[PDB]
Amino acid sequence: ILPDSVDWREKGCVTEVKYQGSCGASWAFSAVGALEAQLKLKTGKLVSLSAQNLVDCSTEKYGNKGCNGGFMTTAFQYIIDNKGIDSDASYPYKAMDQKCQYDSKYRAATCSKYTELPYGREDVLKEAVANKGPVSVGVDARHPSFFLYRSGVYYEPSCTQNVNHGVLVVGYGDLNGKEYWLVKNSWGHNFGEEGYIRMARNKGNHCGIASFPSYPEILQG
Numbered sequence: 651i652l653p654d655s656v657d658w659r660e661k662g663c664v665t666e667v668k669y670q671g672s673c674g675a676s677w678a679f680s681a682v683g684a685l686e687a688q689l690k691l692k693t694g695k696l697v698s699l700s701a702q703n704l705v706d707c708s709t710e711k712y713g714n715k716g717c718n719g720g721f722m723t724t725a726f727q728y729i730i731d732n733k734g735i736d737s738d739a740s741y742p743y744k745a746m747d748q749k750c751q752y753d754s755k756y757r758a759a760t761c762s763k764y765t766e767l768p769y770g771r772e773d774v775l776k777e778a779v780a781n782k783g784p785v786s787v788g789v790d791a792r793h794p795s796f797f798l799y800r801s802g803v804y805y806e807p808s809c810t811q812n813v814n815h816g817v818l819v820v821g822y823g824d825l826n827g828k829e830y831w832l833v834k835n836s837w838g839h840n841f842g843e844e845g846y847i848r849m850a851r852n853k854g855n856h857c858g859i860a861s862f863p864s865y866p867e868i869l870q871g
């Protein structure tokens with residue numbers, strides 16, 4: 651029996667909401683967000699990791715296209731291959747494609763492995779959020795209602811299971827008669843609930859939230 655609700659912000663495992671601007675780098679923010687939580691669990695320190703590092707350096711070999719989109723899972727593979735990722739402080743976000751400037755002197759995290767969860771399984775996603783930490787997911791965000799969301803549990807009848815926007819599931823719950831996923835976005839603090847959106851849960855893989863989940867791990871050693 652899983653907890654009725656989870657919120658990894660309450661364990662100090664979630665950094666401030668970021669603002670991607672005109673650069674389509676949500677995949678990079680989702681990836682660093684998932685890795686930030688594992689880093690805090692392992693080291694006790696909460697430090698924002700460089701989404702710009704991924705935009706500039708996790709490119710064609712990883713199937714990623716910087717400000718034109720990418721994947722959280724291949725971002726994790728880049729961090730594994732590169733043996734590190736810089737802090738956001740040392741390598742801050744510029745919302746444009748730049749030359750790779752990774753510097754091991756400012757490495758703030760590593761990645762050992764990642765896990766991909768099965769397509770559409772919200773029960774498996776619930777277990778991973780409860781037992782492993784925040785989970786990178788894609789959602790279908792191509793609806794005016796998503797851009798216009800302010801509060802409550804989001805439900806868009808015309809949503810599809812085909813994803814196009816990377817976000818971070820940091821928890822789940824059940825409030826006001828509605829089950830939801832707690833989602834950290836990267837559209838700044840003025841979007842939604844202080845930068846978060848609660849999305850309908852157990853409504854048939856609504857907006858594809860459980861289509862392509864993945865999470866990284868940092869192992870001892």
Ligand SMILES: CC(C)(C)OC(=O)N1CCC(CC(=O)N2CCc3c(c(-c4ccc(Cl)c(I)c4)nn3CCCN3CCOCC3)C2)CC1
Pocket residue numbers: 676677712713719720721722724787788789811812813814815816817862
């Ligand atoms: C007409 C053509 C043939 C072009 O497409 C279709 O027929 N489609 C379009 C795609 C539809 C399915 C779908 O949503 N995804 C296709 C499969 C997919 C998508 C995402 C994903 C995750 C997070 C985010 Cl944020 C985003 I953004 C995407 N992860 N994965 C899993 C494999 C990713 N790869 C990356 C490279 O290394 C190998 C593994 C998007 C099905 C219908």
